[PDB]
Amino acid sequence: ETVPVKLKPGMDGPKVKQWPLTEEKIKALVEICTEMEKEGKISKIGPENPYNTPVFAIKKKDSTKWRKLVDFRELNKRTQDFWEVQLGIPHPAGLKKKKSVTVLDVGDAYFSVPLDEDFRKYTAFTIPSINNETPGIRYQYNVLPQGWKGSPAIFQSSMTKILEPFKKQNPDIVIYQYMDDLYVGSDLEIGQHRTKIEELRQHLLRWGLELHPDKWTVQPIVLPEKDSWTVNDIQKLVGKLNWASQIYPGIKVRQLSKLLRGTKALTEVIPLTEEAELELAENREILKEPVHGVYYDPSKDLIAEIQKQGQGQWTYQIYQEPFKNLKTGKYARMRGAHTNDVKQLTEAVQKITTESIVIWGKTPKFKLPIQKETWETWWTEYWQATWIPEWEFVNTPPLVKLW
Amino acid sequence: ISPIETVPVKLKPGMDGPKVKQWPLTEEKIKALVEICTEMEKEGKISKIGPENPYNTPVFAIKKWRKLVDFRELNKRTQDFWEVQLGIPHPAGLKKKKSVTVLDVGDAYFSVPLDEDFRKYTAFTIPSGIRYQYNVLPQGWKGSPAIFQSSMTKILEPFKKQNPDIVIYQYMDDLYVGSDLEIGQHRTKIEELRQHLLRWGLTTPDKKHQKEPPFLWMGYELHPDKWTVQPIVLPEKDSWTVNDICKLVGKLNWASQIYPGIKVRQLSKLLRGTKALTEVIPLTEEAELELAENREILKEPVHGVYYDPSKDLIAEIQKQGQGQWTYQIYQEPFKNLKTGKYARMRGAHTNDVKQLTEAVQKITTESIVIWGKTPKFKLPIQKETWETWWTEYWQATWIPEWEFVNTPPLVKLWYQLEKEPIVGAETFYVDGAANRETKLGKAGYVTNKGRQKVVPLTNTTNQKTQLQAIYLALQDSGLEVNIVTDSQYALGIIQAQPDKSESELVNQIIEQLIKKEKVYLAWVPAHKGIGGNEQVDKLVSAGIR
RNA sequence: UGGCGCCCGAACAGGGACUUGA
Ligand SMILES: Cc1ccnc2c1NC(=O)c1cccnc1N2C1CC1
């Protein structure tokens, strides 16, 4: 029996417009959508369904086969009440403390159960046609769609019994699925952890279905250290500390600014006095400690900011209120060959959200330092995650970019 | 003989069908309407309902008399439909077809049966009333285009499946059938399609009435082997009005996609601050030559070519000054698939490199829309200059693929701010304040040598005061300066390195910045007693606070 | 009568910079 699904009160079906796709993506989409229709996972629809959802085709990591993903963010927001209150997945607080966490993919299991007939019309999507020479082929989901936050909520009933033999044989293993993935954490050796994952995988194939959280450490702000403190260097230090005072209430720049009383050239090496040395030492001590009074609020959606420090280095901060960074880090470049910035930004976005899912269990709202057109055109090429976070495009102020 | 499945149609939730009294018409209109309805009823697409059905929709005949039924109330009450073909295919994205027809399907919406449970909602009355209802899609209805398009798509599916080579395009009711085969066999294939459609009840014109190429479609002139825009005629007159320049700008924009080197920046600029259509705005000196040059571009025929999937797609961007970029998307030399222009200064402060990147984004977005692939660009910017830009920029800019073309208008960074202080230069602590109510401001600077200066400013906002203060520093100084401005807005203006700006003050600032060999722009927080900033606020804020 | 592309204007919401008064 299909589990009834209803949108939030006063909300209507997602009427989003499909973003244009490349020839390779459209050809792949038609190749796999036709097979899905043949298998009954999806079915064609007429022009009486005004609801559409964007569709993008991606190549999964360490794979060459195209993997369709549907931008169900808008539908997730519409069904927020259902998948957040009616049916929800508790977040294990111990997952972020596990030595090794592996992000499995159990999204193919959602196709094994049907979708409520009254809700299928909201899952409709359109496959664009090159140059619009022919009308885009329109389909709808007859089974729990992948990427829709209600799918794991509905499937958790069967998931609990699927994982019960494993959760009972290995009680020390913490398992938590967010959207389509399945985050498996364990305090075991890498080789043995993979062995356990292989046993779990067999437990999933029978029923028909890498991360190091302990290696994650915040990136505290560190002030520059040098013997020759020129007037410009102190001016930058004072400005940075003044901005940091908003984040850290205990930061004071009265003594440092006392040295800059008169009008002096930016290239003048002014020596630090004992009171200023103490002032700098206190600022250093404060800046190497966690922010006081900051706590996670589940009722408030996470907000993630990303800055382009240059030379392939990216710094990010996850917060719910301004100057209340819950987690600050630095995404050292992994791919790009010193020539691609959108690919690095996409990788940073995926890593940041994957960290958020492991820690807090939700995708933060991103403030990407990129043009809307550039990202909207090239984020789909380097995307390799079954989930999609919410992002917005803003201009990064120069002062907060200094980390 | 129209065995076409009827698409279910459901009314909006909580709303009932239209109930509007039909306003009486003239005797001639009534006689024409009843004659048309009687014949249509004979065709079988109209039936009588009597007083049982309470819904009604008014009618009126517009001069033979063409019956029109206004479904205003029904169009705003029926469920929203998804018109998949929101856009249209650009001719450049098509492919060279040996022969093409139009097959104008007569009675397009009048051959698709309407939903049995919805026909009672399209009811209408004819004054003596003789109530009628539509058994097929009525013209002007919101759902008629989408439903008809789906019905034709399903009708064409059996034929298209068995004829992969033949390409069929339906815009509203015309079927542009491209075959690429010989004319002798192409005609036979068209006859086969005509009979196949006739099987489903749809009627098409005889081969003797088929429109010959070129086909006038959506402003284009589509020949089987080449495409062009419709004849663009620019009015030849002196007294140019806002509405007339609107026509000139729109027509030039239409011609821009094929005709190269069309500029509409000056003419568009003539539309700033103009509301009434009767304002006789004389063509300025900067725009008259531009208009004559466009007339020179449009006085000759330029014919584009069609997409060839077995060839590389190139897009050579060019710069013609004043933030105007023209690109010629071509596959073979001097065979531009479609030209274009990107004259849009996003924001009030941008440079050539950033504008070029935005133009690239526009070209990539439309190329993907039209061809589904990003062309191999040929930009004029040097490879090192671009590297210097994107590596030292705060956005995640990236150009997919592009070589270097040595066109005379090269793209370069006119000036670069020093990354470190300048030894031996003179520091300039610059700030300004503007009165809240009197709109009178001041701008000044203080240096190590003790130089002092304050220039009264009138009708200048606070931001302009900071910008002016920087301008003074750039004026009264040497070739090496360390400007210390405590306004983040000024930093945003200068650190972005804009080649040109809408405002004249910033243009003067950048003009002076270019002259400077080494310029450093520092920053200190305001109201913190840092260096000479306090001694500057003590000068530029005397009568303002 | 509606839809679409472009421009100008206004009312809107949030985000950022800044000024003054309390
Ligand atoms: C207006 C239009 C829109 C889309 N495609 C086409 C056309 N019409 C043509 O005349 C045409 C010309 C050349 C190649 N394809 C064409 N066709 C394709 C169908 C053969």
Ligand SMILES: [Mg+2]
């Ligand atoms: Mg000031």
